[PDB]
Amino acid sequence: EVETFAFQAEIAQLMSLIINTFYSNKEIFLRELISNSSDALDKIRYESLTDPSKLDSGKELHINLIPNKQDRTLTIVDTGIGMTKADLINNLGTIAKSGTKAFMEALQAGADISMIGQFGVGFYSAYLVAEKVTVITKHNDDEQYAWESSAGGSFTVRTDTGEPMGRGTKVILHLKEDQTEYLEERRIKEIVKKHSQFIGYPITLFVE
């Protein structure tokens, strides 16, 4: 069964801003997602130092970038801590409420969209390039879930029956028709080198 939820009004407002504002420097979505992956990998690494069994779901700590021109998706995969149902439905939105307010305040005063990551809401920059985002995630203490949203004020959560992932998160970007450059090897390499060159985990860019 699929459950449908409304975003909090402030998140919905953030998403509409991201979708609606004219802003050409869209490529920053990728460093925001890689940065989120890096934080998640830091988290499981740290937690495993006092409970080694937390890596029974997989010892390798890495990031994969997987373009698929047939499906028109760019997927950012990590083996980080993953997210629980409670994260997906309630807790991330709760935390994002204050970040959104600060960000939207910063934007008048002359900040720009590239600075979104300073406010803890960089995930939503995915909507600069994606018409739909699907997030598949597995946390040690919980089941594998699929979260999905095409914005418009709602998202869904379902238990995921797909290929079990062990532990971590896949963000599947269903790209807008005019954003297929982010499926091109040379373009992704350029962006990673420019914005994500010092991430402390291997980033493997898959080819097609």
Ligand SMILES: CCCCn1c(Cc2ccc3c(c2)OCO3)nc2c(N)ncnc21
């Ligand atoms: C705000 C950072 C924590 C939430 N989070 C995020 C950011 C985020 C925020 C909101 C989200 C979301 C993801 O999926 C659905 O809603 N990415 C990851 C990740 N790769 N691994 C673990 N946790 C993540």
